[PDB]
Amino acid sequence: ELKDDDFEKISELGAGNGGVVFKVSHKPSGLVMARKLIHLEIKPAIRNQIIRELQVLHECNSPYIVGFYGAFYSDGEISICMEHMDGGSLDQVLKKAGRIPEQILGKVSIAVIKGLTYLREKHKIMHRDVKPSNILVNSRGEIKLCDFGVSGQLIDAMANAFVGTRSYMSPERLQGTHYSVQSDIWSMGLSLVEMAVGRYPIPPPPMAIFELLDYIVNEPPPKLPSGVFSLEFQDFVNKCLIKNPAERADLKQLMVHAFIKRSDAEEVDFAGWLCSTIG
Amino acid sequence: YWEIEASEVMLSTRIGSGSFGTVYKGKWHGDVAVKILKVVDPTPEQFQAFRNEVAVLRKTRHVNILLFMGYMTKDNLAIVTQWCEGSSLYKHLHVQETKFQMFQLIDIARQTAQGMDYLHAKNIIHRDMKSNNIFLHEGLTVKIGDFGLATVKSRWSGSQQVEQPTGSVLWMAPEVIRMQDNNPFSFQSDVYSYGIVLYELMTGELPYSHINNRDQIIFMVGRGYASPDLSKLYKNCPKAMKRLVAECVKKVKEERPLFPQILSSIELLQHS
Ligand SMILES: Nc1ncnc2c1ncn2[C@@H]1O[C@H](COP(=O)(O)OP(=O)(O)OP(O)(O)=S)[C@@H](O)[C@H]1O
Ligand SMILES: Nc1ncnc2c1ncn2[C@@H]1O[C@H](COP(=O)(O)OP(=O)(O)OP(O)(O)=S)[C@@H](O)[C@H]1O
Ligand SMILES: O=C(NOCCO)c1ccc2cncn2c1Nc1ccc(I)cc1F
Ligand SMILES: [Mg+2]
Ligand SMILES: [Mg+2]
Numbered sequence: 065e066l067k068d069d070d071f072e073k074i075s076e077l078g079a080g081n082g083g084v085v086f087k088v089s090h091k092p093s094g095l096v097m098a099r100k101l102i103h104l105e106i107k108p109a110i111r112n113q114i115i116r117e118l119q120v121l122h123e124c125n126s127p128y129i130v131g132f133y134g135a136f137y138s139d140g141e142i143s144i145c146m147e148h149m150d151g152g153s154l155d156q157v158l159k160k161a162g163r164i165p166e167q168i169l170g171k172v173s174i175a176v177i178k179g180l181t182y183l184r185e186k187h188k189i190m191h192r193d194v195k196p197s198n199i200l201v202n203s204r205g206e207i208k209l210c211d212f213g214v215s216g217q218l219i220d221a222m223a224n225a226f227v228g229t230r231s232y233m234s235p236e237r238l239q240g241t242h243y244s245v246q247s248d249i250w251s252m253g254l255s256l257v258e259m260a261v262g263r264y265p266i267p268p269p270p271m272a273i274f275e276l277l278d279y280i281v282n283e284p285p286p287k288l289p290s291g292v293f294s295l296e297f298q299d300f301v302n303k304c305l306i307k308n309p310a311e312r313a314d315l316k317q318l319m320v321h322a323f324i325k326r327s328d329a330e331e332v333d334f335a336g337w338l339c340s341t342i343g
Numbered sequence: 344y345w346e347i348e349a350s351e352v353m354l355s356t357r358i359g360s361g362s363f364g365t366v367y368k369g370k371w372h373g374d375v376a377v378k379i380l381k382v383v384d385p386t387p388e389q390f391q392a393f394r395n396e397v398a399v400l401r402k403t404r405h406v407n408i409l410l411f412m413g414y415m416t417k418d419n420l421a422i423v424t425q426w427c428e429g430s431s432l433y434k435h436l437h438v439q440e441t442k443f444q445m446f447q448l449i450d451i452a453r454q455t456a457q458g459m460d461y462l463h464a465k466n467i468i469h470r471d472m473k474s475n476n477i478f479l480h481e482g483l484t485v486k487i488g489d490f491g492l493a494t495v496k497s498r499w500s501g502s503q504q505v506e507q508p509t510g511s512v513l514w515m516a517p518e519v520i521r522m523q524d525n526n527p528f529s530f531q532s533d534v535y536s537y538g539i540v541l542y543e544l545m546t547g548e549l550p551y552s553h554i555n556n557r558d559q560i561i562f563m564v565g566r567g568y569a570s571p572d573l574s575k576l577y578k579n580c581p582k583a584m585k586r587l588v589a590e591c592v593k594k595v596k597e598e599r600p601l602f603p604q605i606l607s608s609i610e611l612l613q614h615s
Contacts, residue, residue: 103360105438105475140359216555224549225557226362227508227515238562240554272507272522277562 066090066134066145071099077152080197081228083141087148090133097133098149102142104221111137117215118144124187128179130200130208142218146210151201151338153210154259158196161341164259166297170327171334172199172259173300175207176252177324181315183212184245192219194251195232196259205335228273230264235281236309246309249318250285253304257286260293260301296323345394349417352377361489362471362510363496364422374426375412379419380495388502390420392494397422400491403465407458409478409488422495427486432477436543445579446613447483448544452584453609454485459537460602463530467491470528471510472536474543493528512560513549514539518596520565534599538591539571545588546575567594584612 071088074096078085083102090097106114114137121132131147151157154172157164164172176199183189191198191212198211213219234250237243257265265286266276285305288298300323306312318324352371359366364378385393393414400411410425432451435441443451455477462469469476469490478486498505506525508515516535519527542550550571554560563569571592576585587608593599600608 105434107438107440220555223551223555223557223560224511224513226510227512227520227561228557229507231558233556233558237556238559240559240563240568270507273558274521274561274565277558277565281562 066136066143068136068138068143073099077148078156078197081226082222088145090145096148098146100144100146102144102218102222103140104142104224105140106221110217110221111142113217114142114215114221117217120187121214124183124214126179126182126208127206128175128182128208129212130210149200149206149208150203151342153197154199154201154255155195155197157201157338157341158259158262163262165337166260166293167327167330167332168334168337169256169260169297170323170330171332172207173252173256173318174324174328175199176209176255177315177318179209180245180248180252181319183209184315187214189214190243190245191248191251194248194255196255199255201334201338203335203339205338207334230266231273231276231280232258233277233280234309235307238277238281242309244309245315246312249304249312249314250306250309253301254286257288257301257305260288260297294323294326296321296326299323345398345413347371347413347415347423349415352415352418352423354418361475363492367421368426369423371412371423374428376424376426377415377418377421378424379421382420382495382498385420385495386499386501389494389499389504390416393420393492396491396494399465399467403462403467405458405461407454407485407487408461408490409486420495422492424488425486427478427480427488429478429480429482429484429486431475432479432485432540432543433474435479436474436547437549440547443544445577445581449584449609449612450483451477451479451485452541452544453606453613455487455537455540456602456605456609458485458487459533460606462487462490463533463602468493468528468530469533469536471496471514472533472540473511473514474540475511477540512557512564513551515564516596517564517567517594520561529596530601531596531599534591534602534605535593535596537602537605538588538599541584541588541591542571542573542575545577545580545584547577548575570594581612581615583608587612 070091073086073088075087077087085100088099118135133145135144193211200208200210232251232254234247237247300321303313352369355368357367364380367377369375369377397414412423414422476489480486514536516532519532551560
């Protein structure tokens with residue numbers, strides 16, 4: 065198993081509203097892994113249930129899902145030990161470079177679709193948190209998904225949270241109606257738009273969190289700026305950003321989409337571009 | 344007076360973090376609580392506003408509110424307050440599931456109302472009012488902490504307070520969730536947060552247990568589609584207590600009672 069005393073924090077990878085992630089060294093094994101600290105005050109039974117539900121992540125093995133070593137509760141905090149991703153997350157890459165190039169995004173979207181279909185097919189798990197900060201990259205060019213809803217009790221416990229700044233939630237989830245992987249596809253589409261353009265697209269070229277939620281429930285979905293992107297990419301994001309879940313394209317339609325096939329055929333030096341833009 | 348010399352204070356084991364700072368246990372002139380504020384580079388305007396709030400909070404002295412000793416600018420930016428050995432109200436209700444009798448619950452409600460009435464009489468809007476910021480000192484005496492501090496809880500766009508909401512959304516009043524006004528924090532928002540605390544006391548559970556997403560909660564509370572359902576209240580809860588909690592969580596801001604009215608209602612309750 066894993067214990068708090070076995071880790072020596074090297075640096076702070078980053079922090080979110082829920083918690084903070086530390087790049088740590090596992091002394092017994094000597095390998096650098098990422099340790100996410102999620103602070104929450106919950107009952108001991110809820111803690112045990114969250115740990116048990118997170119134990120499913122041991123068989124969540126995919127080239128598009130970040131690795132998992134273990135999870136434990138130390139002191140008022142849930143700690144999940146996942147594989148360290150040198151590239152960080154796509155939010156960091158967006159902070160580095162003005163806008164992600166379209167071909168790299170094609171590669172990212174292929175990775176996101178493959179990870180979502182892996183979770184759905186072999187675990188019946190919805191990501192629920194497809195954000196640029198929840199897609200992690202490697203110095204070797206891998207693209208992987210993290211922070212997906214494996215534990216329902218953890219989701220319930222994190223419902224009691226502090227207010228946020230932005231959101232990538234589909235309108236059907238905000239309105240509270242039935243939601244499926246179409247919600248994750250809407251989130252992917254919003255993330256791809258936010259990474260293709262140099263900004264969060266909810267307020268089309270600040271606004272509080274409720275104003276953003278109201279906009280993405282009661283206003284047309286955002287679209288890529290025409291004239292500087294290929295028609296296939298625009299069509300892909302438009303099919304992902306459809307307010308009605310039924311009209312919205314599912315994973316099967318996205319895979320055979322013209323943009324996905326174009327990007328798969330294209331050869332892009334993702335690792336080299338990542339190293340150039342992040343140093 | 345004014346700032347505290349950091350050499351005098353000693354930081355003991357860290358306790359935890361919250362919406363705007365991380366709490367450390369201190370030992371300055373006895374046991375104190377030190378919160379290192381998340382603000383890295385406080386603007387001179389922001390720092391001066393924080394020092395004015397610090398003076399105002401220092402002046403306060405009520406049995407049901409924790410003392411605000413002062414601040415220190417050496418250990419980054421930090422605020423020193425009274426340390427409470429007793430557990431928080433949130434831990435009692437939810438984490439520890441403390442079995443309170445009905446009269447103990449009414450007493451906690453009354454003492455919280457007493458402290459909040461003192462704060463509002465001083466023109467202090469205890470934003471971020473919740474079960475986390477209530478401590479049951481000496482077993483049952485209520486202690487309200489983490490009040491005011493709007494200049495530090497809110498990030499600052501330089502000389503401009505971001506003027507956006509912060510803190511837990513389960514207790515947040517709808518009008519300040521929407522942020523339709525630059526100044527949505529008032530006595531009535533504190534009364535709504537107090538009503539959510541009353542709901543926790545009279546149910547033993549957090550509101551909106553059927554919603555497991557924070558953004559869904561934000562949207563549905565701001566749009567008026569979600570309210571804490573009062574069928575969850577205990578059957579032995581007195582009917583006028585139910586009326587008070589209903590009146591405190593009213594969606595309309597002006598419909599919510601002020602804290603003298605809440606105190607009068609609870610005093611009527613205790614005498615039955
Ligand atoms: N395995 C990891 N390897 C490297 N960096 C990571 C890893 N996991 C998380 N991070 C970083 O830690 C940051 C904090 O992420 P989270 O704690 O999940 O919250 P978040 O991604 O910021 O999303 P929210 O909405 O703010 S909670 C991310 O933005 C990443 O940059
Ligand atoms: N004066 C205090 N005495 C004892 N424990 C305290 C005190 N103030 C805060 N704490 C504890 O410190 C931890 C974090 O508290 P805070 O930083 O104030 O966050 P919070 O009170 O949960 O919410 P906010 O909105 O940030 S004030 C919790 O475990 C509190 O119980
Ligand atoms: O971390 C989470 N959210 O953080 C960003 C906003 O969602 C998160 C949220 C919900 C959840 C349910 N079960 C685990 N959950 C998470 N943890 C997590 C899970 C798998 C991996 I691999 C890595 C992780 F960090
Ligand atoms: Mg994350
Ligand atoms: Mg507190």
